Amino acid sequence: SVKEFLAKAKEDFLKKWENPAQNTAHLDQFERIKTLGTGSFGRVMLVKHMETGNHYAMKILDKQKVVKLKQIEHTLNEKRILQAVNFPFLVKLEFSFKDNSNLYMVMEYVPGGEMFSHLRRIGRFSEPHARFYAAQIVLTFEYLHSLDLIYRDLKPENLLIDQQGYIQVTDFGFAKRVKGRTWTLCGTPEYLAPEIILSKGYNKAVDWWALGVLIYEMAAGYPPFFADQPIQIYEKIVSGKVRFPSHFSSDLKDLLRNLLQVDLTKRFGNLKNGVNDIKNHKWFATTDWIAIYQRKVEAPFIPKFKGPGDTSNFDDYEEEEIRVSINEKCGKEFSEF
């Protein structure tokens, strides 16, 4: 039945994966309201779909900037994977399109804000609160890894909280469909597995290393490995000398020693029993895995939400008006988009 749900969700993914949705909307169907977040090539904005009055989150990416950074293929990955997945804790793509200057992905608007904001403000989450979140990621990675996807950029920044207190993963920019191994040095420094850092070739197990980082950060309020300069972060990751706060329970410490494990023959999520080694661990004993999937666990934190189009759970950003050039930019490079 876990096995039966995954074979069905696999047929549904491959259909969309082999024949991606293209050009299902246009810019002038949306009113741009406010910037919710940025990245190297643009921004995600609260928008209003004018024909329905629905709010969405629209990612805008400047194609020339994508090319100047040699990231064409990672952006195509991002859109092809996003349009094809479907799981309760993945942010759902409604539309995508492009014009002369830009790429556009209209997503579900997730009004509760980034986990990163709440984590920093509150300082840290108690163990039950972190577990609640962790369990969602464990199921999301179970789903993704079954499709042969690696996510590769897990962090509080990409984990949005929706109206009922649940997670929506965003920012699939480093997501990639890989049977076998891959070698790109990419990720967030704090979250990178040792094998990514050592240029070794890696697989989906780098996501499970990252899960250990996240849990650790959720529960302590700081990540297991940090320092002012990325190079110093990587020195500490390759040493793999983790110190735990005294408040971490002995079950948590034991989960984390098995996730933040340098040796792939011993890292949880990568072994014979795969993901079940994580679900059947003591720290998750009070976790009802089917109730998490079905959204029927009470969330420990329900965001304040004073009406649609309200953006109070997000930081403020400089706005920049969109320009659409009269000439097509980089048309062949983004032709499948």
Binding site: L185, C186, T188, E190, A220, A227, P245
Partner: peptide, 20 residues
Amino acid sequence: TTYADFIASGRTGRRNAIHD
């Protein structure tokens, strides 16, 4: 403390990814 060392660091804001 570890906490104070973190808050005093340059790494408590949003973190950007590295890449190829």
